[PDB]
Symmetry: D2
Subunit: 245 residues, 4 copies
């Protein structure tokens, strides 16, 4: 409806999701980990695109109490909360045999357990109004299981099962819970990658084109619609034909 909290909204997909919902007149809490100035930049642009209430909120979601507090902070600053987009996520890519306990733990913590925490707190608020929209930004690799990042794949596949369980548990309380699974989306960060990496990724995609963050946001805006009330428990891939889903 009228409130949303978007995690990791200072750049890339989160920013696009933030700016897209601003265009729909949503009030927005723009969450960020470190780059506060960038988050403020997005907040100003969201205001310029039509958002009537925008606040920036800084939290390190690796801190257990941070993810729990974030939802209540967001609700306070917005005057309520009816929408949660769990977009934030980190990588610690390595081969399994070289992967340290900490490299695994950080990725599962930020990408899955933190999303637990935010989802649980958001549902408690949504249950009372008898309306809510929750969208988890997973990754196609959660389905495909491409090598080199078994930690990241486990986290994103877990996020999908998580999405289905919460969907089923809250469906008669007016809350939908869905996932959006980006393929290979071109951002400032992926452009930093070696040329060799880009071409190998690009090679896998039937559409023969990286996606744009704005495309992922369109799917997000569709699911958080009041008009998407009978869609729940679903994973929608935005990937140019990469995933057989």
């Amino acid at each position: 409806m009228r409130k949303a909290l978007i995690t990791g909204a200072s750049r890339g997909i989160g920013r696009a999701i933030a700016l897209r919902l601003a265009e729909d007149g949503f009030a927005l809490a723009i969450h960020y980990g470190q780059n506060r100035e960038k988050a403020e930049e997005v907040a100003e642009e969201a205001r310029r695109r039509g958002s009537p209430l925008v606040a920036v909120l800084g939290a390190n979601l690796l801190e257990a109490e941070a993810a729990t507090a974030l939802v209540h902070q967001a609700a306070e600053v917005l005057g309520g909360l009816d929408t949660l987009v769990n977009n934030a996520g980190i990588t610690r890519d390595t081969l399994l045999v070289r992967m340290k306990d900490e490299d695994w733990e950080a990725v599962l913590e930020a990408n899955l357990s933190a999303v637990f925490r935010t989802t649980r707190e958001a549902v408690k608020l949504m249950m009372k109004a008898r309306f809510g929209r929750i969208v988890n930004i997973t990754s196609v690799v959660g389905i495909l299981g491409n090598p080199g990042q078994a930690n990241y794949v486990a986290s994103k596949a877990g996020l999908i099962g998580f999405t289905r369980a919460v969907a089923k548990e809250y469906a008669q309380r007016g809350i939908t819970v869905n996932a959006v699974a980006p393929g290979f989306i071109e951002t400032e960060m992926t452009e930093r990658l070696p040329q060799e990496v880009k071409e190998a990724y690009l090679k896998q995609i039937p559409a023969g084109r990286f996606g744009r963050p704005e495309e992922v946001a369109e799917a997000v805006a569709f699911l958080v619609s009041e008009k998407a009330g009978y869609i729940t428990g679903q994973t929608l891939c935005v990937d140019g034909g990469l995933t057989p889903h």
Copy 2:
């Protein structure tokens, strides 16, 4: 925008046509037998903002009818960039009692006819280098509840993925999407048993399936292809 919607005289097809009418699509409203009901839909689509609506009768069990239908639609609309394969039939029965004819009819109308319509449409889209195809499949193509209909709808999901990958670099996308339709005609005891299976605890409305179709046919969905979206209240994993 110019769209052919199959089986658009009632239920989900009718909802898709009226919803696309609201986006100002020109529309070819296909029907099998009930022409008058198709005209009523066509009248309502005009009233909702479609600048050009035409009705087209074709029995999709005739092979030449499916093929001709896309050409007829393109001629009446002045081109064709969207195809919504919604029309479908059932001939329900236990496998052990299922006659060859009852298998063949369901496969024909629901899958082979869709093959022919999609073939003809892609030819036209691939000239313009733009297209949207949405197959209305059913959750039972995944769940396989107790066989002709399920085979047809599963085959339709496979076909969607195949055609998506084949035309992905030609600016064409190909995607697939318990609803209150003629379903209201069913015994109260059957309905209530369906309802207990649905986490949302309510049947969907045709307009809800239509909203997903409208999103997928939008230019806002250009990077979505090969996908099957369930609109089902949490029913299917």
Copy 3:
């Protein structure tokens, strides 16, 4: 148990499945389309490997009455029928826009409608004994949807939905119905293919190796076991890691 009908058992996967079950002491009806002498070859080898009753049966499954008759012929020649492996299948590969009505119809007929016919007739017999094993040999492309053969993909995806429906409809009657989805299996026929084709196929496979027909047969032998009674409605991919299933 003790009877099986294997379709398309004169070469490749069907032959391997035939020879594998012979090793388990099964009685076998070896079905073939055209190459009768090759079918007799397989029958002799099945005998040499331990099958106590082997018969060759010729049928063109494009003929509706052929697929229906086949099961009854098999039952007659074997003294009963408790196992059906639907392995037979044809291709008519072309781009969608060049695909003739007949190229589509032939592939759906032989690969799906014919399997209807055999499955329906087999279930009728199995229902009475309160035991049966049905395995459909699909293809990973039924899930993946690789281009160039939309007819073949529709047929194999339909075969999967079909497998699930019949599984659910007959599960309390002691019958299991499962599918085995071969990846890229090296046979006499695939070796005939241009070198360029082989390398592109091979390139997609994590295991970096074509499968052997014998490997597909091992999976088949597992599912038709009496010990596999709680497995039904499932699709088991034998593909070196190609399909995310």
Copy 4:
């Protein structure tokens, strides 16, 4: 053959150990707390033909315990070529009542501990250029019935696919597999409601899940990897 089976003192784990015993595997029987029950299983495995059986106590909630466990098993058996990650815990509750600790414990034991065991095993397998890993996951990782346990098991399916693809050319395979266990302890009304959902209309037996594990750990399954096989009486699509 030398296998480590986690949580092998009872139910499915015990069935897997006894079934592998019949193929003459040397076995490391892991248990969390009930050592005596693990010894009983170890005794029965010897009696069924295992040439070398050892029991290993480790609380997989301790990070160093999971890591050490694979090294202990390899030392007692004289190597290790098979790992069956079967051990799992539940802390069931509605999401809105689910404490941080109850989420974390289930994720730890069911997923993070499996990460650590699999990591250690692949190191050893990848020296020998041969290995079999089977993750015992649960159909609920797919179905998502009403969240900690489901997340853990879905994550385990993802992890299986990821590790399969990473070690596919090293002669190692990585695969995943309502059963009558402690499930008999449940109220009759709960059991009967589960049964109505199962097309086969009966609960599975631990030995049936064990048979699938034995097939996947065989050299006859060398070209199967990255896959999840449900043993469920037709429950999951």
